[PDB]
Design an enzyme around this catalytic site. Structure first.
Site, PDB file in Angstrom:
ATOM      1  N   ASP A  35      37.793   8.605  10.731  1.00  0.00           N
ATOM      2  CA  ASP A  35      37.348   8.185   9.652  1.00  0.00           C
ATOM      3  C   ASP A  35      37.494   6.749   9.056  1.00  0.00           C
ATOM      4  O   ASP A  35      38.455   6.466   8.903  1.00  0.00           O
ATOM      5  CB  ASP A  35      38.058   9.353   8.609  1.00  0.00           C
ATOM      6  CG  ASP A  35      37.632   9.056   7.149  1.00  0.00           C
ATOM      7  OD1 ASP A  35      36.302   8.347   7.020  1.00  0.00           O
ATOM      8  OD2 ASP A  35      38.044   9.604   6.211  1.00  0.00           O
ATOM      9  N   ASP A 220      31.199   3.851   6.483  1.00  0.00           N
ATOM     10  CA  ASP A 220      32.068   5.256   6.459  1.00  0.00           C
ATOM     11  C   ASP A 220      31.619   6.391   7.633  1.00  0.00           C
ATOM     12  O   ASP A 220      30.818   7.029   7.102  1.00  0.00           O
ATOM     13  CB  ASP A 220      31.962   5.697   5.100  1.00  0.00           C
ATOM     14  CG  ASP A 220      33.020   6.868   4.861  1.00  0.00           C
ATOM     15  OD1 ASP A 220      33.655   7.460   5.709  1.00  0.00           O
ATOM     16  OD2 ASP A 220      32.829   7.359   3.633  1.00  0.00           O
TER      17      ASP A 220
HETATM   18  C1  LIG Z   1      40.760   7.288   0.105  1.00  0.00           C
HETATM   19  C2  LIG Z   1      39.907   8.709   0.385  1.00  0.00           C
HETATM   20  C3  LIG Z   1      38.605   8.739  -0.341  1.00  0.00           C
HETATM   21  C4  LIG Z   1      38.250   8.931  -1.745  1.00  0.00           C
HETATM   22  C5  LIG Z   1      37.102   8.800  -1.932  1.00  0.00           C
HETATM   23  C6  LIG Z   1      35.927   8.422  -1.219  1.00  0.00           C
HETATM   24  C7  LIG Z   1      36.290   8.009   0.049  1.00  0.00           C
HETATM   25  C8  LIG Z   1      37.670   7.978   0.636  1.00  0.00           C
HETATM   26  C9  LIG Z   1      35.220   7.284   0.963  1.00  0.00           C
HETATM   27  N1  LIG Z   1      35.238   8.174   2.424  1.00  0.00           N
HETATM   28  C10 LIG Z   1      34.606   9.443   2.631  1.00  0.00           C
HETATM   29  C11 LIG Z   1      35.694  10.049   4.002  1.00  0.00           C
HETATM   30  O1  LIG Z   1      36.989   9.626   3.821  1.00  0.00           O
HETATM   31  C12 LIG Z   1      35.510  11.325   3.611  1.00  0.00           C
HETATM   32  C13 LIG Z   1      36.350  12.135   5.189  1.00  0.00           C
HETATM   33  C14 LIG Z   1      36.139  13.601   5.508  1.00  0.00           C
HETATM   34  C15 LIG Z   1      36.823  14.483   4.624  1.00  0.00           C
HETATM   35  C16 LIG Z   1      36.673  15.735   4.783  1.00  0.00           C
HETATM   36  C17 LIG Z   1      35.737  16.462   5.556  1.00  0.00           C
HETATM   37  C18 LIG Z   1      34.871  15.282   6.307  1.00  0.00           C
HETATM   38  C19 LIG Z   1      35.195  14.085   6.178  1.00  0.00           C
HETATM   39  C20 LIG Z   1      33.818  15.930   7.379  1.00  0.00           C
HETATM   40  C21 LIG Z   1      32.409  15.665   6.566  1.00  0.00           C
HETATM   41  C22 LIG Z   1      32.295  16.655   5.612  1.00  0.00           C
HETATM   42  C23 LIG Z   1      31.077  16.355   4.761  1.00  0.00           C
HETATM   43  C24 LIG Z   1      31.264  14.842   4.135  1.00  0.00           C
HETATM   44  C25 LIG Z   1      32.634  14.885   3.164  1.00  0.00           C
HETATM   45  C26 LIG Z   1      32.532  13.513   2.537  1.00  0.00           C
HETATM   46  C27 LIG Z   1      33.748  12.769   2.545  1.00  0.00           C
HETATM   47  O2  LIG Z   1      34.406  12.688   1.591  1.00  0.00           O
HETATM   48  N2  LIG Z   1      34.196  12.145   3.735  1.00  0.00           N
HETATM   49  C28 LIG Z   1      33.793   7.383   0.454  1.00  0.00           C
HETATM   50  C29 LIG Z   1      33.930   7.208  -0.977  1.00  0.00           C
HETATM   51  C30 LIG Z   1      34.207   5.800  -1.552  1.00  0.00           C
HETATM   52  C31 LIG Z   1      32.708   5.727  -1.880  1.00  0.00           C
HETATM   53  C32 LIG Z   1      32.576   7.040  -1.645  1.00  0.00           C
HETATM   54  O3  LIG Z   1      34.922   8.166  -1.846  1.00  0.00           O
END
Ligand SMILES: CCc1ccc2c(c1)[C@@H](NC[C@@H](O)[C@@H]1Cc3cccc(c3)CCCCCCCC(=O)N1)CC1(CCC1)O2
Length: 371
Positions: A35, A220
């Protein structure tokens, strides 16, 4: 050298890419979502109906409690848990072992996913967005600090169940074609960048370039879609409707609610247009562009079905996997810059291709950033 790392990522479409790691002694093995959009290393540490494996820290002689708790909310989904440290390695990664901070996940909501095959997340971004605060050193900083691994990694995400490569410590020439182009990391928190022009089938969208970066634009790997600010998203969907008006599709299509299909091998790719993002370059008034095909922004799922993987955001531009799958992407932390090159596993189309091209000239690129 880097061959050991080639092909070390696996995945299910739209549920992220993960790499195998081990934690504690004796080694416990887990699949960890890679990530670039967050900055904690976290791991299921107790039963959950969608885990089939978890970190049992009772069994590790290297486990150290830090006696703090910690919480992290993502876009949808979140978890809480217990902080500690332990020994970590990456089997198909550099040949090394580090002491890293680790969040042991005790509860979660809509985080873990039904049979994804991963059990934690490796936030590769910077301390500034770590929970609880910026002082919890993230994995990669611990890696760099304790070993001789250079401060960069690169990602080759292949689309279509999926795979790719995470090369830690450098750039592997087998994973791309043509040259690399670079864009400055604007600020070390997310991997933030500045988009300075957007075009859809040749035509500028003609907004103030600030609206492209409204909030922030980030790279991302944990996000699936190309996500765009409301005004930009509206503007990009007008132009993608018009380019493709040969046929009309519902509305739930454009909102990503419903799929669209065609008899196998009939997909009318040619009616859907290429999108170009122009990014801030390395030299004065210099930009370059990356071009993506409909084969990237129409995510697949006897006829061929696809979802529209451009979605609206109120929280900035997100260049997620849709965008990354085109390219080899170099997170050169040491030089504060992100490299793009055409991927070797590029999703090739008979009449057009994904590209990285430059230089171009663009005035006032710094002013495209939002403050
Ligand atoms: C600091 C934690 C955080 C909080 C909010 C956040 C982010 C990060 C940014 N990154 C998104 C990413 O971290 C996560 C990781 C993740 C978590 C759980 C499951 C997954 C992926 C697998 C994919 C599932 C569908 C997409 C989920 C979107 C997401 O939040 N991904 C992306 C943004 C910042 C702009 C949008 O939002």
């Amino acid at each position: 050298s880097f061959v050991e790392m080639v092909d070390n990522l696996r995945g299910k479409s739209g549920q992220g890419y993960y790499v195998e790691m081990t934690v504690g002694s004796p080694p416990q093995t887990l699949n960890i979502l890679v990530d670039t959009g967050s900055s904690n290393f976290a791991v299921g540490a107790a039963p959950h109906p969608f885990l089939h494996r978890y970190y049992q820290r009772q069994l590790s002689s290297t486990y150290r409690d830090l006696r703090k708790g910690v919480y992290v909310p993502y876009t949808q989904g979140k978890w809480e848990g217990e902080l500690g440290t332990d020994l970590v390695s990456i089997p198909h990664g550099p040949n090394v072992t580090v002491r890293a901070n680790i969040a042991a996940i005790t509860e979660s909501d809509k985080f873990f996913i039904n049979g994804s095959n991963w059990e934690g997340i490796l936030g590769l971004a910077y301390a500034e967005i770590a929970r609880p605060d910026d002082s919890l050193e993230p994995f990669f900083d611990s890696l760099v600090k304790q070993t001789h691994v250079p401060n960069l990694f690169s990602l080759q995400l292949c689309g279509a169940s999926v795979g790719g490569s995470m090369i830690i410590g450098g750039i592997d020439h087998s994973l791309y074609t043509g040259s690399l182009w670079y864009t400055p990391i604007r600020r070390e928190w997310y991997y933030e960048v500045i988009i300075v022009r957007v075009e859809i089938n040749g035509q500028d969208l003609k907004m103030d370039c600030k609206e492209y970066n409204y909030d922030k634009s980030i790279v991302d790997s944990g996000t699936t879609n190309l996500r765009l600010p409301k005004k930009v998203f509206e503007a990009a969907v007008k132009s993608i409707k018009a380019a493709s008006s040969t046929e009309k599709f519902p509305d739930g299509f454009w909102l990503g609610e419903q799929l669209v299909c065609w008899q196998a091998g009939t997909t009318p790719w040619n009616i859907f247009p290429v999108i170009s993002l122009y990014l801030m370059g390395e030299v004065t008034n210099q930009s370059f562009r990356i071009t993506i095909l409909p084969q990237q922004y129409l995510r697949p799922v006897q006829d061929d079905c696809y979802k529209f993987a451009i979605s609206q955001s109120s929280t900035g531009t997100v260049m997620g996997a849709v965008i990354m799958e085109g390219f080899y992407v170099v997170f050169d932390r040491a030089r504060k810059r992100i490299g793009f090159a055409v991927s070797a596993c590029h999703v090739h189309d008979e009449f057009r291709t994904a590209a990285v091209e430059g230089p171009f000239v663009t005035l006032d690129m710094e002013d495209c950033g939002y403050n």
